[PDB]
DNA sequence: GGATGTATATATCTGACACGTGCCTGGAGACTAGGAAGTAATCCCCTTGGCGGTTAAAACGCGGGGGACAGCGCGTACGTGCGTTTAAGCGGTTGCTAGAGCTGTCTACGACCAATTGAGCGGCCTCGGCACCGGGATTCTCCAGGGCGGC
């Protein structure tokens, strides 16, 4: 069975355990339990669906198919998470 | 006697200054209308310092036990290091399409103004329901007569 699905669904596993460890090191965490990574993947996914849903709404209002950075800045500012350095 | 360390001179690289040009956006000048400042009147709320009385909350003290904290043991789960795999990162192909920018035309849609009128705000009268007063029906406590016993 060489053939398989073209699309990939485990892209939340692409946020690897060393990446989450580096994020915790930047946050100042010395010791990390083994169940941290699944919870971090879940909260990152929830945050990303919120921001991406608002940015897709901003894109669809402008009758566009691409998602610009300015829509992402709008979506983050609407959630009280203003980001500097991408225009505006 | 030969080659090495070091000083001064010359060519080249690179950020910065000034020159040039477009253009379009801000500034100068004039006019006008209305937004806001000022005025007077009326009425209601807030301020400061008091008094009186109720009463429930606040304060104080005390006993006791529940919970916070410290110490110790233990076992497991995470850190650390190394070898191996793997996929990210970069550079690249190849076409098509989405989108920004610019120009051009036009048309439907919204601003604007005048006349109108009907939906919103206040009061007035009435009804639904709750309550106060008068009258009829039902049940409970009581005073007196009859009969029996004693000296």
UniProtKB/Swiss-Prot annotation:
Sites bearing N6,N6,N6-trimethyllysine, chain numbering: 6
Modified residues (N6-propionyllysine): 2, 17, 30, 63, 65, 77
Physiological role: Core component of nucleosome. Nucleosomes wrap and compact DNA into chromatin, limiting DNA accessibility to the cellular machineries which require DNA as a template. Histones thereby play a central role in transcription regulation, DNA repair, DNA replication and chromosomal stability. DNA accessibility is regulated via a complex set of post-translational modifications of histones, also called histone code, and nucleosome remodeling.
GO molecular function, one term: protein heterodimerization activity
SUPFAM superfamilies: Histone-fold
Complexes and interactors: The nucleosome is a histone octamer containing two molecules each of H2A, H2B, H3 and H4 assembled in one H3-H4 heterotetramer and two H2A-H2B heterodimers. The octamer wraps approximately 147 bp of DNA.
Phosphotyrosine: residues bearing it: 37, 74
Signal sequence annotation: none
Protein's organism: Xenopus laevis
Localization in the cell: Nucleus; Chromosome
Known DNA-binding region: 2-6
Protein known as: Histone H4
Phosphoserine PTM positions: 33
Keyword Phosphoprotein: yes
Modified-residue entries (N6-methyllysine), positions: 6
PANTHER family registered for this protein in UniProt: HISTONE H4
PTM annotation (N6-lactoyllysine): residues: 2, 17, 63, 77
Pfam family, one: CENP-T_C
Gene3D superfamilies: Histone, subunit A
Residues with the N6-butyryllysine modification: 2, 17, 30, 63, 65, 77
Keyword entries, A-Z: Acetylation, Chromosome, Citrullination, DNA-binding, Hydroxylation, Isopeptide bond, Methylation, Nucleosome core, Nucleus, Phosphoprotein, Ubl conjugation
């Amino acid at each position: 069975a060489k053939r398989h699905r073209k699309v990939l669904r485990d892209n939340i596993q692409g946020i690897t355990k060393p990446a989450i460890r580096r994020l915790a090191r930047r946050g100042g965490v010395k010791r990390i339990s083994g169940l941290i990574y699944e919870e971090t993947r879940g909260v990152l996914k929830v945050f990303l669906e919120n921001v991406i849903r608002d940015a897709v709404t901003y894109t669809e209002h402008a009758k566009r198919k691409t998602v610009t950075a300015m829509d992402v800045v709008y979506a983050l500012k609407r959630q009280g998470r203003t980001l500097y350095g991408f225009g505006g």
